[PDB]
Design a protein around this nucleic acid. Structure first.
Ligand SMILES: [Mg+2]
Ligand SMILES: [Zn+2]
Ligand SMILES: [Zn+2]
Ligand SMILES: [Zn+2]
Ligand SMILES: [Zn+2]
Length: 1341
RNA sequence: GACUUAAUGUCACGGUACCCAAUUUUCUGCCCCGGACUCCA
RNA sequence: UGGAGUCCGGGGCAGAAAAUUGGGU
């Protein structure tokens, strides 16, 4: 009579808001969700409600199951025949049912003995309820021979808790882009998948059928089902407000956008990175510590504050805590800074009796051969019932409530439908709302196909792929083009289930299954999910097992076992013996070569072109966000990915380094666009160019799918990642810039041990020969080194040495006159300053027509220069990765000792060093701006006691006054200690208005901040100059001069009216942006807004005396240098009247001989921490490097070639110890190749340099280069007296501080007390001496 | 009971949150003169 | 009434500026 039945889901079932049948047509979502579960609210506010399943829907499922069961049994179930049943209600006779069947009614041959009526009816009619008192309108529950009550959820209830709203999708087959999308709620089957209802049956006769119907109901509301008969976020936001405010107080608001990312990356790490303080620490002996994690938040370090927050918010998970903290920081930073839904006929279907209906069940694992991405809408708008950018992660991956990676049934089904459409060779676009089922083969097969929403046993956080778009014109980041994608790890396995209820297993579905397989010799081709063009979600079907239900003769076993819906993983795990009766292994699965649609449509659909890139230089695809959260404190580290190991069932411990499929695809796209000119198109809207056809428009899809360039040589390298320090040298002073010092952590590539990056891309079937040739040409361009991988390509990083495709796919004869002073002084009695300042002049030529990188301009030159750098003096390029390279830190604590710069044991000159030295020389040649300048640096000079505006009884009186004052102070201290404290600070008067400008008060603040006291803090605090501290405030007893100077004490330091940037002329300032133009140096070598057109590779050593060899040093090849101290602009600019002298250039001298011959003295007198020990090259060492230039004008190329090889006796200065004579390097061009690849003859090279000279003459207003005054000064600055057969050995050294200081030459005036004195040497004469190169300084000219 | 179904008709497993974009642009691991404040003849 | 003086010591920066999403169906 009455039975209670529970329907249990095994997929996230579809939930829609319940509406009355009259009110349902108003909303399209409810029209779509008629076959879904229905959610009805309670109360107001749309927050609480109950979910249920209408008994009409369960009745429809039961009726479909009964129709199927009777068709397989030819209308006779359990020996009692059933008629075809009636499924047509005429409007005139009665009201139409609320749901009208648009599908084929699966009929049979009616063998009923008598026509069914109210008195007698077959079980089909009883279950249909044709003849009971109940009709279309409902009166009472006792009028139903069959009654399906509403199925109420068993477990107030909140919609967001039960269901999650997700935008689904319809994707066009031809273009690969979505035609439209729609929203659905996917409720939790794990917690809310059981719905209990009541079915009443007045007529017991049909009972045996009805129960079986519950067995054959496979899916309901979008989920496979079986029917059985029986606020921390607010607190985190407030804390993130505190952190953002603390960053604001430090003027570091932008770093919050960094922090909000890094905090999120912490979710990949465990809580230990906060609990065990595994965040990177700052540099050794650094007061500020880490630039991010040591930022003081409410007076405590950011790492400590994060630890306190984690302890406070330990109630929520570490992943949730870090996600919400990063999101809140992101939102506070942001604040502080086609939905398509959806003639009745009764079409019978009578399958032939001879043909039998079976059910195939295919189980397996979808393993992500590449990182997968299943797009989902942001959690902000994913709230069910609710259907500033406020999205921390741009692209979020689809997960569960348990954070498990989920492949939705919808995405898997859509990918399978696409693959089936390809395999059949033809198909239809899925039409929505069609009253007639589509007759296409694809749709017919898909109606028989059921798939299971697969979720992984892996819940670890997704990795973040950072994608940018390069601006083709300037080859820099497009403005606004930066986003993050949540991607699941590759190798992750999902339980794949595919049921096919059909007469025979189609050949095309077998072809698709074989296509998705990898087996042994093929690759899995299940392009599930999105971002496929960037090689996302290429899945492989593995561990496959296909079984068979004989539904025509063994249907009862299927009904009993419910088709094992929800037990498919157990079936995959179980063996052949444990299979249930009626489920036999399907051993007829045709092999891969047997499927005609596979070889004719699926095998050639995506052709795999796999290759290996040999990178002969260090490769840095920067991952800064990970570097912020990882130990080592590196500003940029190489990108590494998390790979899931199925065998270990966990992420592999050591990440796989790779050049991103996004980076790979972008490199290829840029190559193709530049070779075709399509990259230069302003917009690609409704475009059809070759680049758009190959790589996809906003409407079509990419015909080429790039995957990651996995590093496969990593095991070979003993130290895979190389630490390369970089610095920016101020143009005016040869010292480093104030804040521009950093370090990179690329992969240690080298010409002898290149990094092998194996990567593949898939070519769409039917690719044009033009497009295939374009792809091959782009691959050759990568092979030819045109496009370096990763960042710092212009500095030498990521230079591609070669490419292996898989089998199954000149001298400059100028002799400079030199300087007359060293030539006349053949006995070398004169002494010259180690550095002199070249003032080319304030006039700087800026070109506003910026040469673009969007194409290789035909008239402009593009090629490679092979040059032979040769050291004329010992070269010191220290490998500052390890400050203990020589392993003498233990013997001498605090002593920095480096090896020569080497990658994998072979000596090198980093291309950044060569690029910087050549850039300095070129900017001196072309009168370019001071690209690197300490503009913020101020100037201060000690004033002596002069300050020309332009005994026993006295000692006893002083002593008595001091004693009386101390007695008074002690008496007041006895009276009140605080009163004495104030008296000493001057807050209160002790018995016995010139306005202050902002700049003057700022000068006082800098004097206080730059005050250099005693080193020892114990004596410093007592003996330091006592001021109330920090900034000038009300009540500070101070000194002033008419006012001009606000000094804390008498005889303090004068401060300059203008900073160093103010001292420098306006035209010489570094170029900012591109609107005002770029100087020749900044146009050639590039700026922050414009990528440079010259890339300097790493200079590899070949031959020569390998090292400078010396007895004294512990390493015989090493050498200890003198005290290299910071350049003093106060000497070059003695007073505020003096202007910036110009670029600092160091003389070419054998002053290293003095250092080498005085090694014991340098080691004994100099404190170990002050000086450094280095591995040192010798004279004659030969390195070779490549200057890869693109779109270079003829005069630009000529000037660059003149910069490389200036003349016969003109060389350069490179590496450490330049003021000590080290680094005199002679560069000689072996060859100049230019492609449009042809070697340029010497005559053409000379014509380039000759017409480069013409540009210099034009700017000033075989060529002699010294006729140009500033070029003459620059070349004598770089003239090498000892290079030729000349016997000149000039004495070039810094003066000592005073006579008593060590190193003072006895009897000479070469002392800084003498030279800094205005009487012995006035300021203007000193500046003139510093400005005229090779001016004698011991006898001053 | 009701919330919440209508019964001779639910292909919604009828729909891939899909397509487009190079974590990159610039930078010499570099370097010499200062660093303090008073004293009373 | 103004006189100019007493010291030989000492590291620095260690990332900066940008882009942090836009279009489509
Ligand atoms: Mg009825
Ligand atoms: Zn009947
Ligand atoms: Zn179709
Ligand atoms: Zn185009
Ligand atoms: Zn410039």
């Amino acid at each position: 009579m009455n039975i209670t039945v529970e329907l249990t889901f095994f997929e996230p079932y579809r939930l829609v808001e319940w509406f009355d049948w009259d009110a349902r047509k108003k909303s399209h979502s409810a029209m779509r969700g008629q076959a879904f579960a229905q959610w009805t609210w309670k109360g107001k506010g749309r927050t609480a409600g109950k979910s249920f399943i209408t008994g009409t829907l369960v009745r429809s499922a039961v009726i479909k199951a009964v129709e199927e069961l009777l068709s397989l049994n030819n209308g006779k179930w359990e020996g009692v025949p059933c008629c075809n049943g009636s499924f047509q209600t005429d409007e005139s006779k009665g009201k139409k049912p609320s749901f009208l069947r648009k599908r084929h009614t699966l009929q049979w041959q009616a063998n009923n003995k008598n026509i069914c009526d109210k008195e007698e009816a077959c079980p089909f009619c009883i279950l249909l309820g044709r003849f009971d008192n109940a009709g279309k309108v409902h009166e009472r529950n006792k009028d139903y021979d069959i009654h399906f009550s509403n199925f109420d959820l068993d477990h107030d209830l909140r919609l967001v808790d039960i269901a999650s709203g997700r935008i689904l999708n319809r994707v066009d087959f031809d273009t690969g882009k979505a035609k439209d999308y729609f929203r659905t709620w996917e409720a939790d089957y794990e917690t809310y998948g059981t719905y209990t209802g009541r079915i009443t049956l007045r007529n017991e006769h049909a009972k045996k059928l009805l129960l079986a119907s519950l067995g054959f109901v496979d899916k309901l509301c979008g989920a496979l089902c079986r029917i059985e008969v029986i606020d921390h976020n607010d607190e985190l936001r407030k804390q993130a407000e505190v952190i953002v405010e603390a960053f604001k107080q430090n003027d570091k608001l932008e770093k919050i956008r960094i922090l909000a990312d890094a905090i999120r990356t912490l979710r990949l790490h465990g809580e230990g990175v906060i609990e065990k303080d595994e965040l990177p620490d700052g540099k050794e002996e650094r007061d500020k510590g880490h630039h991010l994690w040591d930022i003081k938040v409410q007076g405590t370090a950011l790492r400590t504050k994060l630890k306190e927050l984690w302890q406070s918010n330990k109630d929520i998970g570490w992943r949730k805590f870090t996600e919400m903290l990063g999101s809140n920081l992101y939102l506070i930073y942001k604040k502080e800074t086609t939905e398509y839904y959806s003639s009745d006929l009764f079409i019978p279907v009578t399958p032939p009796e001879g043909i039998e209906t079976k059910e195939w069940i295919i189980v397996g694992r979808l393993k992500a051969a590449t990182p997968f991405y299943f797009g989902v809408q942001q959690p902000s708008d994913s709230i069910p019932g609710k259907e500033v950018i406020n999205e921390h992660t741009s692209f979020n991956i689809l997960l569960d409530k348990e954070n498990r990676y989920r492949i939705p049934r919808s995405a898997l089904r859509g990918a399978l439908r696409r693959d089936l459409r390809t395999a059949f060779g033809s198909g239809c676009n899925v039409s929505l709302g069609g009253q007639i089922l589509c007759n296409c083969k694809v749709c017919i097969e898909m109606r028989r196909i059921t798939l299971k929403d697969s979720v992984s046993d892996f819940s670890e956080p997704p990795e973040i792929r950072y994608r940018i778009a390069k601006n083709p014109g300037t080859a820099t980041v497009e403005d606004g083009s930066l986003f993050d994608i949540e991607v699941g790890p590759e190798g992750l396995t999902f339980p794949f289930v595919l049921r096919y209820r059909g007469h025979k297993f189609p050949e095309q579905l077998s072809s698709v299954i074989r296509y998705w397989e990898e087996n042994d010799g093929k690759n899995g081709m299940a392009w599930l999910g999105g971002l496929d063009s960037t090689g996302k979600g290429r899945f492989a079907l593995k561990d496959i097992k296909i079984f068979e239900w004989d539904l025509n003769q063994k249907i009862n076993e299927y009904i009993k076992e419910r088709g094992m819906r929800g037990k498919e993983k157990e079936l995959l795990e179980m063996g052949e013996s444990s299979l249930p009766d009626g489920l036999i292994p399907y051993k007829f699965f045709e092999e891969r070569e047997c499927l005609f649609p596979y070889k004719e449509n699926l095998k050639p659909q995506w052709s795999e072109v796999q290759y290996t890139i040999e990178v002969g230089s260090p490769l840095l695809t920067a991952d800064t966000i990970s570097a912020l959260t990882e130990p080592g404190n590196r500003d940029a580290i190489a990108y590494k990915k998390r790979v899931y190991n199925d065998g270990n069932n966990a992420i592999e411990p050591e990440p796989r380094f790779a050049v991103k499929s996004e980076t790979h695809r972008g490199i290829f796209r840029t190559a193709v666009g530049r070779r075709t000119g399509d990259l230069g198109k302003e917009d690609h809207e409704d475009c059809t160019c070759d680049m758009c056809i190959i790589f996809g428009n906003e409407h079509e899809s990419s015909k080429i799918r790039f995957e990651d360039l996995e590093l496969i040589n990593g095991n070979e390298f003993e130290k895979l990642e190389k630490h390369i320090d970089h610095v920016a040298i101020d143009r005016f002073t040869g010292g480093a810039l104030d804040k521009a010092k950093f370090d990179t952590y690329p992969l240690a590539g080298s010409p002898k041990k290149p990094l092998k990056l194996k990567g593949r891309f898939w070519i769409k079937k039917g690719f044009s020969g033009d497009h295939k040739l374009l792809i091959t040409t782009a691959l050759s361009d990568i092979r030819d080194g045109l496009y370096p991988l990763g960042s710092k390509g212009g500095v030498g990083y990521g230079w591609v040495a070669g490419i292996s495709i898989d089998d199954n796919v000149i001298n400059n004869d100028y002799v400079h006159p030199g300087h007359q002073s060293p030539k006349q002084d053949h006995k070398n009695k004169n002494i010259y300053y180690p550095h002199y300042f070249l003032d080319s002049g304030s006039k700087v030529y800026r070109e506003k027509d910026i040469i673009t990188h969007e194409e290789f301009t035909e008239e402009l030159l593009s090629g490679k220069i092979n040059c032979k750098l040769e050291t004329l003096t010992p070269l010191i390029i220290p490998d500052t990765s390890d400050e203990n390279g020589l392993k003498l830190q233990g013997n001498k604590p605090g002593h920095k000792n480096y090896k020569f710069f080497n990658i994998n044991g072979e000596l090198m000159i980093p291309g950044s060093e060569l690029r910087g030295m050549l850039r300095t020389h070129f900017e001196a040649l072309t009168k370019s701006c001071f690209a690197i300048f300490g503009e913020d640096s101020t100037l201060s000079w000690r004033m002596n006691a002069d300050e020309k505006d332009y005994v026993r009884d006295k000692n006893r009186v002083f002593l008595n006054a001091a004693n009386n004052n101390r007695q008074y102070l002690n008496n007041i201290k006895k009276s009140n200690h605080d009163l004495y404290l104030q008296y000493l600070k001057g807050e209160k008067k002790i018995r016995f208005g010139y306005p202050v400008d902002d700049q003057i008060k700022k000068n006082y603040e800098d004097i206080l901040d730059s005050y250099d006291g005693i080193k020892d803090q114990e004596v410093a605090e007592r003996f330091d100059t006592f001021t109330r501290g920090s900034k000038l405030k009300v009540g500070d007893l101070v000194y002033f001069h008419i006012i001009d100077s606000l000094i804390p004490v008498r005889i303090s330091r004068k401060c300059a009216s203008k900073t160093l940037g103010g001292k420098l002329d306006k035209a010489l300032h570094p170029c900012t942006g591109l609107s005002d133009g770029l100087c020749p140096g900044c146009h050639l070598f590039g700026t922050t807004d414009y990528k440079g057109r010259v890339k300097f590779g790493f200079a590899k050593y070949e031959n020569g005396p390998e090292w400078l060899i010396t007895r004294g040093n512990n390493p015989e090849r090493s050498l200890t240098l003198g005290v290299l101290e910071s350049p003093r602009p106060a000497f070059s600019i003695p007073d505020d009247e003096s202007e910036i002298p110009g670029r600092k250039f160091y003389l070419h001298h054998n002053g290293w001989r003095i250092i080498r011959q005085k090694q014991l003295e340098i080691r004994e007198t100099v404190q170990p921490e002050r000086n450094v020990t280095t591995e040192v090259m010798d004279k004659g060492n030969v390195f070779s490097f490549d200057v890869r230039f693109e779109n270079l004008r003829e005069w630009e190329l000529g000037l660059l070639l003149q910069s490389l090889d200036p003349g016969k006796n003109i060389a350069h200065k490179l590496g450490k110890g330049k003021p000590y004579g080290f680094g005199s390097v002679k560069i000689k061009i072996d060859s100049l190749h230019t492609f449009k690849i042809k070697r340029v003859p010497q005559s053409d090279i000379r014509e380039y340099i000759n017409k480069g000279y013409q540009k210099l003459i034009e700017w000033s207003g075989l060529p002699q280069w010294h006729v140009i005054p500033h070029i003459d000064k620059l070349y004598k600055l770089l003239w090498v007296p000892f290079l030729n057969d000349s016997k000149l050995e000039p004495d070039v050294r810094y003066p000592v501080l005073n006579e008593e200081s060590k190193g003072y030459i006895e009897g000479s005036d070469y002392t800084y007390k003498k030279l800094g004195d205005k009487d012995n040497l006035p300021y203007k004469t000193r500046v003139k001496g510093l400005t005229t190169p090779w001016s004698p300084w011991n006898p001053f000219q």
